[PDB]
């Protein structure tokens with residue numbers, strides 16, 4: 001009932017993916033070498049500080065197995081979608097369809113249901 | 116009505132402050148020099164990538180005037196609260212009472228209304 005309270009593991013995850021997917025959606029289609037490096041470092045630093053040491057450590061192992069592809073907006077948005085799907089799978093959640101990431105996180109559904 | 120849609124400026128801000136205030140709340144009381152540097156860089160990289168170039172640029176100017184104090188959890192949580200209050204003030208919102216940051220973003224209100 002109270003709005004207004006510290007977020008739990010789930011509520012923080014939901015905020016975090018919204019922040020992550022949204023930053024990804026507006027990342028350049030042709031980023032400079034510096035921007036590519038800055039985004040890889042950003043994702044790295046995010047995994048260092050994400051609290052709940054059960055979620056961050058799993059995440060750092062996952063990122064060690066699978067480095068952020070920050071080459072282009074296309075590559076980075078799909079990479080992040082596939083990353084997020086590994087966590088969905090681990091938690092018994094269904095795969096999100098990565099072809100929809102632009103509609104979900106930038107443009108809105110092509111049927112206009114976000115209008 | 117649809118849940119489920121790309122976040123607007125306001126919804127993204129609300130997610131972003133929740134992510135920022137929550138990362139701050141669990142930052143060490145005695146962070147290593149490396150962690151202090153990693154958090155300052157984290158905040159910097161966040162302002163580089165925050166989308167909507169009207170909000171990010173204002174933010175980068177604000178951070179140029181006012182460097183993240185990442186010395187301790189106490190210092191960093193209060194600094195971030197004061198940062199957020201500058202944005203509240205700019206938008207005609209009232210000041211949030213920074214003594215409440217722990218209750219709001221870590222522990223819950225001492226009256227137990229988050230229980």
Ligand SMILES: Cc1cc2nc3c(=O)[nH]c(=O)nc-3n(C[C@H](O)[C@H](O)[C@H](O)COP(=O)(O)OP(=O)(O)OC[C@H]3O[C@@H](n4cnc5c(N)ncnc54)[C@H](O)[C@@H]3O)c2cc1C
Pocket residue numbers: 009010011012013014015016017018021050054055056058059080081082083084085087088091093095096101104119
């Ligand atoms: C980096 C990270 C690591 C985490 N690790 C763990 C963990 O180890 N264990 C744990 O219990 N929880 C972890 N969480 C929390 C967890 O992933 C969820 O956020 C939480 O369980 C709530 O799930 P949900 O059903 O609300 O949807 P979420 O998984 O929060 O997703 C939010 C929304 O994003 C959209 N979406 C779903 N998948 C994708 C995708 N692949 N690409 C783009 N958009 C998508 C859907 O619209 C969905 O409603 C983590 C969260 C973060 C951001």
Ligand SMILES: Cc1cc2nc3c(=O)[nH]c(=O)nc-3n(C[C@H](O)[C@H](O)[C@H](O)COP(=O)(O)OP(=O)(O)OC[C@H]3O[C@@H](n4cnc5c(N)ncnc54)[C@H](O)[C@@H]3O)c2cc1C
Pocket residue numbers: 004124125126127128129130131132133136165169170171173174195196197198199200202203206208210211216219
């Ligand atoms: C880095 C950043 C920069 C932004 N810059 C702009 C901008 O230039 N122009 C613009 O129109 N919008 C900007 N926004 C969006 C804006 O700050 C708000 O997020 C949005 O207007 C929604 O406001 P709100 O009333 O939902 O509460 P928000 O400001 O989103 O706050 C969310 C919650 O945090 C708590 N809170 C409020 N203040 C503090 C505090 N000082 N310390 C700790 N907790 C607090 C309150 O419980 C509040 O309900 C920015 C957001 C981010 C994160």
Ligand code: NA
Pocket residue numbers: 084087088091093
């Ligand atoms: Na998930």
Ligand code: NA
Pocket residue numbers: 199202203206208
């Ligand atoms: Na604000």
